[model samples]
Target: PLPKSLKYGDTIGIYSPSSPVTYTSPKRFERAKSYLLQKGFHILEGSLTGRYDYYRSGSIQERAKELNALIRNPNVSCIMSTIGGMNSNSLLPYIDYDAFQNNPKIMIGYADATALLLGIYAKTGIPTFYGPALVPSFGEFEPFVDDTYKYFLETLLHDQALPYNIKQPLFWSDEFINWEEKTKEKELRPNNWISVTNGQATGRVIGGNLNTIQGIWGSPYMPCIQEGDILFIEDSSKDAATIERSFSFLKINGVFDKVSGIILGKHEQFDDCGTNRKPYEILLEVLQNQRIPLLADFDCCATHPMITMPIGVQVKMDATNKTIHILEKWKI
Candidate 1:
């Protein structure tokens, strides 16, 4: 079921399936709330909005109940995770899928929340977004945050047309500062997307947060990787060896032989491990010199000021041309 596009007065419900970011960083959370409120959204906090139970927002049962409330609610047009955490997959079995199917709403999040995004899409055929969360993307200062909001609002608020070109942020940053008490803006570098493999293909864009995808890889929650599926994956603060292992896992699963195109977002603070190897280079080695169109370091995942990408939609890609066209209208 395709969700209706968000309009003014649409309520944005916030919940924590994993992290306790709201409790730990009240200032940033409140600021994020205020930012959305300023944009004419009514912010609704979930049952465990500010309450935290140890590392997670609550136990699996408790978090599932919290999310279920949002799923059953009629007021919330969209439900966005407060932030991503490792145990979100822990709440998958407990999710109210039947309720979500009964009432389809826009679902969006990042990183570990990939579990929920892929889980819901697998259980039912509804599409989910791989985009900004509340605290991290919105809580930041200045130019970058606004850029993130622009891509977000454009995707949610407007009725998207076919062949919509996903805009590129002029610049981006992977520079880390105090997430909570930061004072200055991190440095931005020239944005670049390398075309690893040449040629063009149009296919349904699938996958998110490569490492997180592993959690639900063989489960029923992960969407079936059909032939000609376009894969877009990104990571943060990882090293060359870790990427090699991750990419190798995909190769071993026969993922490469199945997909027609691939898009790789920039890795934030990547450590080369003294081998002077980049992520695409490692993937190439894993691919064993296959001929396929693969775009590297493209925005729409992982780096700062991310672009909003609709999962499970047809996208036309020209790796050599360095462009992506949303061939299917992703929003209602």
Candidate 2:
């Protein structure tokens, strides 16, 4: 069930499905909330806001209840995460899917939050976004924050013409600094999408935060990767060896054989561990020369100036041309 385009003044519910970024990064969290409010939107705080329990915002049931309350709230036009962490999968089993199906809303977040994004989609056939979380994306300092917000505004609030072409930002950054405050100007590099393999494939885009997907693999929540589907997987702070294992896991599971294309998002501060090999290179090695239409360094995940993209929707990817276009109306 596709959600309606979010309108100005509509309420955006903020929930912490995993990390207690609200408690940990209070300044950034407040900035994010103010950012949304200044844009003419109402901010609906989740139950777990400013609440924490060691590694996460709350217990499994507590987190699930927080999301369920937002789901049940008819006033909320969209639901977003405060941040992503390791344990979002634990709330999947207890999520109120029935309520979500009844009152559909835009569900957006990335990284470990992929569990909820893919899980909710798998359960109810509802599309969720693989985009920014509040504390990380919206809380960021300009000019990247404006770029990310522009994409978010275009994707969620404004309806685009058919076959909406996604424009790559002029610059991108993955610097680790600036959590609570802006220390200095981050070095923004010229952004360029890498065409790993040249070809074209149009199909439903699937996957996110490759490592997070592992936590829910083989479960009913992990959407069955169908043939001709475009596999979109990404990671952050992972080493060469770690990605190799994850890539091999997909290869062994026959994911490479089924998917028609791959969109590998940029690894935020990837630790190559002295291998000097890129994540796509590791994937290519695992594929054993299976030449799928592959595009790498797409700024849709785990990086500043992230593009907001809808999952389980038709998207035509041209690796040769370095373009990704939404072929259908992703939102109602």
Candidate 3:
């Protein structure tokens, strides 16, 4: 069964799997709390909210405790990550999966947190969201945060009709801004979803923060990439060679042969080589004539104004038509 959709006054439990963002940016954290409170939702802080040990909130055991505490809390209607870092993979073995199975709630988070999200789903068969976190996403100002929140709102408030299509935001940004220093709004670029191939395919969606996927790949935490599933991959601040190497892993692993389609997220500040080629072009060369339906520049990435897509859900992608549609009632 899909986790219960969020309701007004529901308590959203905040867990810091990695990065003590609440301590590093108390101002931003407070503001984000206020944002959700203003929207009629209650907020609950995890144990590691104020603790900062540099790389992560605490040791592997400690971090796992922070999240599991929330998991065991019957009052918490939704468990959301405060932020994500590389250390998220470290907490995998310590998660309270049994408690989650006994009393499950809606789980939402992304980035390096992908480790735990996919792990939980793979272990428990519960669908988790590849969506926003508190500090990195909702903490932002104005139109951008609101746009991102609206997408989240739609996904969590109720189940939508089958074949539901996600609307593309009018603008997006991946510009650098000092989270702790003074800043201005990032310049908004006109947005469009690029079609790398012209075809339509539907399958279960699996994959997030492509780079992080490797940390848990081949382990029990990583869900097996089934035949005909759409594998969406994306990254941020990566150089040309890095993308090539990472993409090579897919080829070497024969992921292209397994999935029916590919959904590539918008690469934030992608450092293409002097060849002046985009990430999709690099993907084209990597294809070596494999014709999977490919959609590039899709939203829901590390950058601003991302859509909160569900992991392990069936979705339809028409690369030629440049559209993605969710084919089921995501939350019921």
Candidate 4:
């Protein structure tokens, strides 16, 4: 079942469980804080929010403590991360699964944040969001896509169903723009969303960034699946070979054997280094014989105009028709 949405004025705790860029860039943190405030949410910073230690937001113990505190805080209606870094895996040993399962609330983030979201879900059957972060998507350079913003707000804050026709936009190959500079762009082109396989599969959405999922493969915190769950994944700025290796890891680990469908999120800025074997091609090869429903959607984060996807919702996937249907609406 879908969790309830948070309301305006609800206290939303912002924490940095991965790398702590917000600590060094106070201005950027303030920009994100102000953006959430404008949305009528009361922002609560975790104790370690501004703590930075080399590549981490803080020491493993510090990050775990702050994260657990927010999860246990009854006043906190939702939890959001500042940004994703490469070191979130360090905090796994220090996490308290009991505290997380006991205090179920909307936890939203992507990139390294995928570790925690999937970890908790795997352990407790508690769903989390793999949507935008405060510093990036919420506080973007361009205005948040109406579809993205509306779906996120409605799904997480109001618990509403987001039904939309899938539309693919053209690829923008310009230098990557940061969230702060998004407002300067005049317009964004729509890109066409393609289907890797044709079929229909109905199941609850699960999965996250491919690299992050691979990081915790052997850990106790990794999510385990029943026979019918849909696995959704995406990656950023990686070579097709690396992606193939990650997919192979999942296959070797028996992930495909447990899930009923595969949904590939956008692989933004994928590089082809004198090799025609694209990541999508590799995906087709791996999934072709599996006879499973495969759907592909552009990762809105990499596009000029992106859509906000609410993870953990019950969605109906129609790969043959190239459409995703939300079965349940989010409500506050």
The number of the candidate with the highest lDDT is 2
lDDT of 4 by residue, 291-330 (tens): 7777776554444334445556577888777777666453
Point to the candidate with the largest TM-score: 2
lDDT of 2: 0.92
Model 4 global lDDT (CA atoms, 0 to 1): 0.71
- Per-model CA lDDT versus the true structure: 0.87, 0.92, 0.87, 0.71
Clashing pairs in 3: none
lDDT string, candidate 1, 253-276, tens digits = 999999999999999889999998
Superposition error at 77 for model 2 (Å): 0.8
In model 3, which runs have C-alpha deviations exceeding 4 angstroms?
none
Q: TM-scores of all models?
A: 0.97, 0.99, 0.96, 0.87
Better of 1 and 3 by TM-score: 1
Candidate 1 colliding pairs, count: 0
Ranking by TM-score: 2, 1, 3, 4
Q: CA lDDT of 91 in candidate 1? A: 83
Clashing pairs in 2: none
Residue 198 deviation, candidate 4, in Å?
0.8
**Clashes in each model (backbone N, CA, C under 3 Å)?**
0, 0, 0, 23
Clashes of 4: 23
